[PDB]
UniProtKB/Swiss-Prot annotation, chain A:
Oligomeric form and interacting partners: Homodimer (RbcX2). Interacts with the exposed C-terminal peptide of RbcL ('Glu-459-Asp-468'); binds 2 RbcL peptides per RbcX2, stapling them into an RbcL2 dimer. A slightly longer peptide binds with a higher affinity, but no long-term stable interaction with RbcL is detected. Contacts a second RbcL monomer via its peripheral polar surface.
Organism: Picosynechococcus sp. (strain ATCC 27264 / PCC 7002 / PR-6)
Name of the protein in its database record: RuBisCO chaperone RbcX
Induction pattern: Part of the rbcL-rbcX-rbcS operon.
Keywords annotated in UniProt: Bacterial microcompartment, Carbon dioxide fixation, Carboxysome, Chaperone, Cytoplasm, Photosynthesis
Compartment annotation: Carboxysome; Cytoplasm
Entry remark concerning the domains of this protein: The homodimer has 2 functional domains, a central cleft essential for production of soluble RbcL in which the RbcL peptide binds, and a polar surface which plays a role in correct RbcL subunit arrangement.
Portion of the parent chain present: 3 to 111 of 134
Function of the protein: An RbcL-specific chaperone. Required for assembly of the RbcL8 core, acting downstream of the major chaperonin (GroEL-GroES). Acts on newly folded RbcL, has a transient dynamic interaction with RbcL and is eventually displaced by RbcS. The central cleft of the RbcX homodimer (RbcX2) binds the C-terminus of an RbcL monomer, stabilizing the C-terminus and probably preventing its reassociation with chaperonin GroEL-ES. At the same time the peripheral region of RbcX2 binds a second RbcL monomer, bridging the RbcL homodimers in the correct orientation.
GO MF annotation, one: protein folding chaperone
Amino acid sequence: FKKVAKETAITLQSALTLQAVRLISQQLSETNPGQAIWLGEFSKRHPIQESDLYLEAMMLENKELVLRILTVRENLAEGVLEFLPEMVLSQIKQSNGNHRRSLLERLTQ
Amino acid sequence: FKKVAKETAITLQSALTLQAVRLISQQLSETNPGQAIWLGEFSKRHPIQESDLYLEAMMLENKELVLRILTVRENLAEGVLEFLPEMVLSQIKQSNGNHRRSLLERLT
């Protein structure tokens, strides 16, 4: 259970980053929508999956926004990371259960 | 506050499944690679990012494997999920810092 710890954390990071870029997109829609469009199309040219390339990339077009994302992305993180393990594990079990119960019923019938 | 918390948790769920399917694929290559090759061939036609569907699919083609993934993905979860909130907050803080220097440097 070694490299998994790291690789997963990175996914999470990009996750929270996208998740931030998702709020900021909505707020933008209301306030400045010319920006909200830009953000969209820019999020089409650059995979949020690779977050750091993504942010650095933005630095050339919207320094101000890079910054906002950085804070939003950190807040959400605070507000969420702790509640996650007692939640993912739960769902894993519930998902694991339903799969096995349905995989065994399919054999039996 | 939490619609987020949910979606991330779904992502992690997907995430770990993938990570398990990887760890199993590795084992199969060192052993039963005729079927390690099959796993490549399956993972190709189906989106692992929607897990509960990737599995249901494989059910209808190789039951023994679905069952093993579920077993493996849950071991994984137990053995990693705790050191996670601490690892990600840390990394996010370390990145945010690095990105701000870089940005505020690039300004002048």
